[PDB]
């Protein structure tokens, strides 16, 4: 059954990432014994939650959730209301409020839409956060699309010197639909994950969350540019290489260029 | 406890919609998942039939020296498929890679003879579009109507590279004098799975009206329609996405902010907005 | 008509020219058209009123300098025609355009309309017997004597990392930016105004290029240089007045690695180099890492190659042998390769003849290049 989990993860890596929720539910139907293993291991699109007391949307993960209920980052309360939920420390809660506010301004500048959520769970040696974002594209347009963040960070605070070992694990779950130009409609689904670790000295001017943020900004600019290329580097060579009309006239030229390069090869040496 | 009938339906959805580079692996993944073989092996055999028809993939029959695509138009109905070029029936085994034990077929083929001249032409143009290209031009009567059904594909699979590009083309040409009617769908699929996944999924539905004149003309007219459509398609598929995806993917999330300055974290944590 | 062919290596900053089968380009001069600002009162003044090359360099202060070509894309076509006419004229080459075949160069992945209009100029206005446009990276490898390897380059207009493996220039793996020496010179000019010493004039713009060429260095750790206070070194201008440069000298060439500082989204030189290696096939990546060739003027900063090596070590997979090689004459690397390519007997087959252009048109030029 360890091979079954390996196959289950291999299957979700090959099926469309647009239908993770439906396929994961069916995969749990087919293997009910792996339900707990698959829900933890298989990454899926983030759920929308609504805080009724504040009147604001928050996002749901395994880390912020304790049992059936999920701590809202705005009110600090779980829905449904649990008696003794796993809350953070009063210092970490104040830090968590400042994280939410900081990453609220983060998202709103990069996307200018959507919803985010930030939750920080208390550790003895550190403070570890999750930064969720979900932005939806223009619904009226034929081109649908969304962008989803799952930045999990682990900060190991050192005792002396005020330095902090950060460990960022960032997933980016994308699905671009393209229905335009009167030539057909294409739907592209991406899912790259990148890891980054760093030790930064703590400043009194800028808190530790700002140090975390700097990793997110740099990671997102790089992951995005990496993603961007893995799209083209494959959608270009593979599709063009299959059905290129200019392949057959250039093939005759390449064969001429093969004689030419061979003549160049001898002449370059001497 | 999930019922045995529920297990087969879950297996069917994955096998019916699996990426063709790894679909035979997906079947192996479904089989390596559920313990017993017979329940999936029996259910997959039906799925493979429907699945291998929608791929337009050719099984090489041992002694033909060419590749005959398989579809709904070649389906005789008795688990054997037509090869309209070489004009022999073949039984296609769906688990195993090969199709063997063929049977010579003989039909009057009056509608079928006309299109086989147009077919042998199409091939030469398929060879022009792709480095490796295989086809099948089915000849059939559909509820009294007279219809050529050319199909083209391309399979480019490599295990080490982790990328797989696959083309399938569906083309139906109904013969009616003078004016004829055409219906065709054109699907691309590419999949990259290194350090995480990326998929290209596509199609173009085209409705066209052609007029029959000569055998040389009808052979070179339909091909011309395909040539221009598939180029315009690839052109748009390559040239729009390299630029427009970059801008639409950017319209969702921008590479830098509206200021074009990396956001200052010190600014965020000690500034107030509004009124 | 197979005379000794001419190699006009184009470029936004500098334009090289000369004959085939030569060691160095004899005719190098900056690519711009100087025109007189002031009113010519006195008789017996500078005649012509359109200055190109060494006359324009000699008489900077009179002339309002303007560049015809930005980011490997000509804006003013009349200016480039005058430059090409000056190249062929008696003041530089001492030849006719009708005699010799032409080898042109351009940056990769440019607009095709500019390539067509370039060919129109060579075939119609000049009466060229045969034309051939080529890549810069392909030539630079022919100059060195290798076939395999990536070519990172940095001129005044374009920075592009082209991977090649045994005479197979992958058109798809070519990365490119519109960020280069001109943008670094513009960013240094902006920093000098923040320091105090403002330069706004077009003749005065070339003093900023001269300061950028001479007094600049790329630090390995930029955060460490930001925390430390600079020494504020001096430099004498063409006039005589001294200028304390300050922290502008080291923060100016950071634009190439951090493109966010000017205010435009791009990858960067070090990212582009990693990105060109990644887009190619898995088996060819380790050979591409081992052979990395440098070229252009904006690779000549102090500690540039050392910073590139550190950036590759950070991004690339671990336990891989990195080697960023470079020639002695980095400025004339592309032209030497063209002179070698032109001297070869194969060159006759590749070119676009004037008869072939008159028959077909632009389509034949698009086919022969790729």
Curated annotation (Swiss-Prot), chain B:
A GO-annotated cellular component: F-actin capping protein complex
Entry's transmembrane regions: none
Q: Modified residue Phosphoserine is at which positions?
A: 3
A GO molecular function assigned to this protein is:
actin filament binding
Localization recorded for this chain is: Cytoplasm, Cytoskeleton
Alphabetical keyword list: Acetylation, Actin capping, Actin-binding, Cytoplasm, Cytoskeleton, Phosphoprotein
Asked if the record carries the keyword Glycoprotein, the reply is no
Q: Which residues carry this modification: N6-acetyllysine?
A: 13, 91
Q: Source organism's superkingdom? A: Eukaryota
Gene Ontology biological process terms, A to Z? actin cytoskeleton organization; barbed-end actin filament capping
Chief localisation class = cytoplasm
Task: List all disulphide bridges recorded for this chain.
Answer: none
Please describe the quaternary structure of this protein.
Component of the F-actin capping complex, composed of a heterodimer of an alpha and a beta subunit. Subunit of dynactin, a multiprotein complex part of a tripartite complex with dynein and a adapter, such as BICDL1, BICD2 or HOOK3. The dynactin complex is built around ACTR1A/ACTB filament and consists of an actin-related filament composed of a shoulder domain, a pointed end and a barbed end. Its length is defined by its flexible shoulder domain. The soulder is composed of 2 DCTN1 subunits, 4 DCTN2 and 2 DCTN3.
Role: F-actin-capping proteins bind in a Ca(2+)-independent manner to the fast growing ends of actin filaments (barbed end) thereby blocking the exchange of subunits at these ends. Unlike other capping proteins (such as gelsolin and severin), these proteins do not sever actin filaments. May play a role in the formation of epithelial cell junctions. Forms, with CAPZB, the barbed end of the fast growing ends of actin filaments in the dynactin complex and stabilizes dynactin structure.
Family statement drawn from the similarity comment of this UniProt entry:
Belongs to the F-actin-capping protein alpha subunit family.
**Protein known as:** F-actin-capping protein subunit alpha-1
Q: What is the lineage of its organism?
A: Eukaryota, Metazoa, Chordata, Craniata, Vertebrata
Q: Which gene encodes it?
A: CAPZA1
Swiss-Prot record, chain C:
| Keyword ATP-binding carried by entry | yes
**Pfam families, per database record:** Actin (PF00022)
Which UniProt keywords are listed? Answer: Acetylation, ATP-binding, Cytoplasm, Cytoskeleton, Nucleotide-binding
A GO molecular function assigned to this protein is: ATP binding
**Which is a Gene Ontology cellular component entry for this protein?**
dynactin complex
Keyword Zinc in annotation:
no
- Subcellular localization: Cytoplasm, Cytoskeleton; Cytoplasm, Cytoskeleton, Microtubule organizing center, Centrosome; Cytoplasm, Cell cortex
Principal location: cytoplasm
SUPFAM superfamilies named in the record: Actin-like ATPase domain
Oligomer and partners: Part of the ACTR1A/ACTB filament around which the dynactin complex is built. The filament contains 8 copies of ACTR1A and 1 ACTB. Interacts with dynein and adapters such as BICD2. Interacts with BCCIP (isoform 2/alpha).
Its function, per the record, reads: Part of the ACTR1A/ACTB filament around which the dynactin complex is built. The dynactin multiprotein complex activates the molecular motor dynein for ultra-processive transport along microtubules.
Name the protein family. Belongs to the actin family. ARP1 subfamily.
Name the PANTHER family for this protein: ACTIN (PTHR11937)
Name used for this protein in its record? Alpha-centractin
């Amino acid at each position: 059954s360890d091979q079954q989990l390996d196959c289950a993860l291999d299957l979700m890596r090959r099926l469309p990432p647009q239908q993770i929720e439906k396929n994961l539910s069916d995969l749990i139907d087919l293997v009910p014994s792996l339900c707990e293993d698959l829900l933890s291991s298989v990454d899926q699109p983030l759920k929308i939650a609504r805080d009724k007391v504040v009147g604001k949307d928050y996002l749901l993960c395994d880390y912020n959730r304790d049992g059936d209920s999920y701590r809202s980052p705005w009110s600090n309360k779980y829905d449904p209301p649990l008696e003794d939920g796993a809350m953070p420390s009063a210092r970490l809660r104040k830090l968590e409020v400042e994280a939410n506010n900081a990453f609220d301004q983060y998202r709103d500048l990069y996307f200018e839409g959507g919803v985010s959520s930030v939750y920080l769970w208390d550790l003895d040696h550190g403070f570890a956060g999750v930064i969720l974002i979900k932005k939806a594209g223009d619904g009226s347009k034929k081109i649908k699309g969304c962008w989803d963040s799952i930045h999990v960070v682990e900060v190991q605070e050192k005792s002396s010197g005020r330095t902090a070992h950060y460990k960022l694990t960032s997933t980016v779950m994308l699905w671009l639909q393209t229905n335009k130009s009167g030539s057909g409609t294409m739907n592209l689904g991406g899912s790259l994950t990148r890891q980054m670790e760093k030790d930064e000295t703590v400043s009194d001017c800028s808190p530790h969350i700002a140090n975390i943020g700097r990793l997110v900004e740099d990671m997102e600019n790089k992951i995005r540019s990496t993603l961007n290329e893995i799209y083209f580097g494959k959608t270009k060579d593979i599709v063009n290489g299959l059905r290129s009309v200019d392949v057959i006239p250039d093939n005759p030229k390449f064969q001429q260029l093969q004689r030419e390069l061979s003549q160049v090869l001898t002449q370059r040496q001497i | 406890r999930v019922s045995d009938e529920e297990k087969v339906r879950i297996a069917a959805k994955f096998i019916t919609h699996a990426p063709p580079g790894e679909f035979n692996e997906v079947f192996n993944d479904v089989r390596l998942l559920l313990n017993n073989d017979n329940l999936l092996r029996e259910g997959a055999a039906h799925a493979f039939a429907q699945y291998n028809m929608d791929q337009f993939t050719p099984v090489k029959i041992e002694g033909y020296e060419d590749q005959v695509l398989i579809t709904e138009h070649g389906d005789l109905g008795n688990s054997r498929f037509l090869d309209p070029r070489n004009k022999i029936s073949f039984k296609f085994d769906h688990l195993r890679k090969e199709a063997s034990d063929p049977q010579p077929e003989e039909v009057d083929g009056s509608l079928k003879s006309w299109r086989e001249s147009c077919d042998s032409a199409l091939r030469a143009y398929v060879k022009d579009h792709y480095s490796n290209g295989f086809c099948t031009v089915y000849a059939k009567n559909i509820d009294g109507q007279q219809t050529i059904i050319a199909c083209i594909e391309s399979h480019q699979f490599q295990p080490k590279n982790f990328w797989n590009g696959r083309w399938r083309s569906e083309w139906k040409f109904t013969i009616t004098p003078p004016t004829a009617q055409v219906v065709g769908v054109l699907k691309i699929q590419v999949h990259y799975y290194e350090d995480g996944n990326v998929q290209l999924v596509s199609h173009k539905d085209v409705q066209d009206s052609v007029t029959v004149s000569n055998e040389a003309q009808t052979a070179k007219e339909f091909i011309k329609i395909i040539e221009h459509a598939e180029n315009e398609y690839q052109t748009a598929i390559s040239e729009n996405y390299q630029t427009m995806s970059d801008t639409t993917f950017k319209a969702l999330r921008r590479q830098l902010p509206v200021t074009r300055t990396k956001i200052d974290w010190n600014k965020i944590l000690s500034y107030k907005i509004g009124k | 008509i197979a005379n000794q062919p001419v190699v006009i290596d184009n470029g936004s900053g500098v334009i090289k020219a000369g004959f085939a089968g030569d060691q160095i380009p004899k005719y190098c001069f900056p690519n711009y058209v100087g025109r007189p600002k002031h009113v010519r009162v006195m008789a017996g003044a500078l005649e012509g009123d359109i200055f190109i090359g060494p006359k324009a360099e000699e008489h900077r202060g009179l002339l309002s300098i303007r560049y015809p070509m930005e980011h490997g894309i000509v804006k003013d076509w009349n200016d480039m025609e005058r430059i090409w006419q000056y190249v062929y004229s008696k003041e530089q080459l001492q030849t006719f355009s009708e005699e010799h075949p032409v080898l042109l160069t351009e940056a990769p992945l440019n607009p095709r309309k500019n390539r067509e209009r370039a060919a129109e100029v060579f075939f119609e206005t000049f009466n060229v017997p045969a034309l051939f446009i080529s890549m810069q990276a392909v030539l630079s490898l022919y100059a060195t004597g290798r076939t395999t390897g990536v070519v990172l380059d940095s001129g005044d207009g374009v920075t592009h990392a082209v991977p090649i493996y045994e005479g197979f220039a992958m058109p798809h793996s070519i990365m490119r930016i519109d960020i280069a020496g001109r943008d670094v010179s513009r960013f240094l000019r902006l920093y000098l105004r923040k320091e105090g010493y403002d330069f706004h004039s077009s003749s005065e713009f070339e003093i900023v290029k001269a300061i950028k060429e001479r007094a600049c260095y790329l630090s390995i750790n930029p955060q460490k240089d930001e925390t430390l206070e600079t020494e504020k070194a001096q430099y004498y201008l063409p006039d005589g007045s001294t200028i304390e440069i300050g922290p502008s000298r080291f923060r100016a060439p950071e634009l190439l690695f951090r493109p966010d500082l000017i205010g435009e989204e791009s990858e960067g030189i070090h990212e582009v180099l990693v990105f060109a290696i990644q887009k190619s096939d898995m088996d060819l990546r380790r050979t591409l890492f081992s052979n990395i060739v440098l070229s252009g003027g904006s690779t000549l900063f102090k500690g540039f190659g050392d910073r590139l090596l550190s950036e590759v070590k950070k991004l690339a997979p671990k336990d891989v042998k990195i080697r960023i090689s470079a020639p002695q004459e980095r400025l004339y690397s592309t032209w030497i390769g063209g002179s070698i390519l032109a001297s070869l007997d194969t060159f006759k087959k590749m070119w676009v003849s004037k008869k072939e252009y008159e028959e077909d048109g632009a389509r034949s030029i698009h086919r022969k290049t790729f």
